Symmetry: C2
Subunit: 281 residues, 2 copies
């Protein structure tokens, strides 16, 4: 009766502080073993792993039938031990937000998390595929994950080849990420950045027989988050940056905070696997 | 290092009257303690080419739990085949997803057999796994040939499902034979709803890097022949203002190809059916 997931495995890693992480890995479906994979392969790391692993895995498998298929790559979902939910609110609050002075308690642990990914997760995944070598590495994240991806690019650009910021929470802590962006731009193989967002995030339409008070509240919230304009402001700031090879920005029409995750992660891994290297910006 | 478990889900094997096997994969909201947690009316979506879309549909449904317009979700049913190392059964689906015609080659035209199997075998089997649950409404999703099946289902047996979701329907198949059924559907006589979608890169594909011009012109020629977008628009215009159709929703996904659009269409498909029902009149 139970659904067994093929060509995939999961294991638990602990960070320096002893906090546990669920590492889920998948590889091309046509593979008989892990060992069958040989030579250079791309790899993508997905934060909030529990929420995205299956979609990223299956989307990657679907590419096998596509004409522009190059051989695929390895999916790595970095998540938490959970039951009956996709997110660890407390853990991700620390792991995904950059350090600031006025940040409340339980925030500003992004550098701890990034160090963990580079020093613990990456080597552990590399060990699972001895015959495989990493052609290139991508970091994907959504919302707070998007903020982490941007933070990673601006403070440690050599860490990953491609950064995929899905609907990044630029709003967080009075637009503190824009300070790092300016410093990154003003400083003298450059990585690539993929920024995306849904059109319904900042400009949500009213539902069927939705009461006005409920709608204006969603409108107010949307206006404050300022998902589209903050993203457009960032991209305009990064425009003509020498430290960035390519900047791809996409507004997914008719997608909201939640629904866009399907789109962004699917295109993210597809372009990284099949369209590398991207054209200069 | 252990295998990856899929929680709040199960699979079982059914066989049609011809003795041909099927893998039925089912999932339900993640917050549920088990199957029996579910009570009262719930929506249910049936996805053909189940092996290719079950995990995306499942996880996309779970992701909606955090969304504002969440209303308890629904049940995902992926109707697939016993496969190992691939997502599609080319031979089986060729029969199951295409409607009967006099000119169709051998191995095609088994859509009615498949739709009977879904209604007579799959639906009751799933209902039996959730006795306390009532089926508020039913949706039939399919992609490519699956989209052709969804349209075929609507035109020949519109009462079978409440919603039909045709993702990039292969209207081109067999000299546009489906337009006969659509023509008869509109020119005769609670009305169901139809969701049609396609990728913008299907009919107008962009050139790849390091792609020879000769190779690119071959892809464009193929794309022009299949005529994904224009055939869909021609069909939607033909169905517009029809009495037997409650709502028609068409979408062109910008920058999506044949394969990539599947992620978008199935995700929005189940979301709209679960959260935005009933659709506004069209
Ligand atoms: Cl601060
Ligand atoms: Cl014919």
């Amino acid at each position: 009766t139970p659904v067994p997931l093929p060509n995939s495995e999961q294991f638990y890693l602990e960070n320096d502080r002893g906090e546990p992480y669920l590492i889920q890995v998948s590889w091309p479906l046509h593979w008989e073993d892990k060992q069958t994979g040989r030579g250079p392969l791309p790899i993508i790391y997905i934060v909030d792993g529990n929420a995205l692993f299956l979609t990223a895995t299956e989307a990657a498998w679907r590419r096998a039938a596509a004409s522009h298929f190059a051989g695929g790559g390895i999916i790595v979902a970095i998540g938490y031990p959970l039951k009956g939910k996709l997110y660890d609110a407390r853990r991700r609050s620390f792991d995904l937000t950059p350090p600031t002075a006025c940040a409340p308690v339980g925030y500003g642990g992004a550098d701890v998390f990034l160090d963990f990914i580079e020093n613990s997760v990456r080597p552990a995944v590399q060990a699972r595929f001895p015959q495989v070598s990493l052609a290139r590495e991508a970091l994907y994240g959504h919302s707070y994950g998007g903020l982490l991806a941007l933070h990673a690019l601006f403070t440690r650009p050599q860490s990953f080849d491609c950064y995929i910021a899905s609907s990044p929470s630029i709003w967080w802590n009075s637009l503190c990420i824009l300070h790092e962006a300016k410093a990154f731009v003003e400083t003298k193989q450059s990585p690539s950045l993929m920024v995306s967002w849904g059109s319904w995030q900042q400009h949500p339409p009213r539902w069927a027989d939705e009461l006005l008070d409920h709608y204006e509240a969603r409108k107010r919230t949307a206006a404050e988050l300022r998902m589209a304009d903050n993203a457009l402001d960032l991209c305009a700031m990064l425009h003509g940056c020498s430290r960035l090879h390519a900047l791809i920005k996409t507004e997914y029409e008719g997608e909201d905070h939640t629904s866009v995750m399907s789109c962004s992660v699917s295109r993210g891994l597809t372009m990284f696997f099949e369209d590398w290297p991207f054209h200069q910006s």
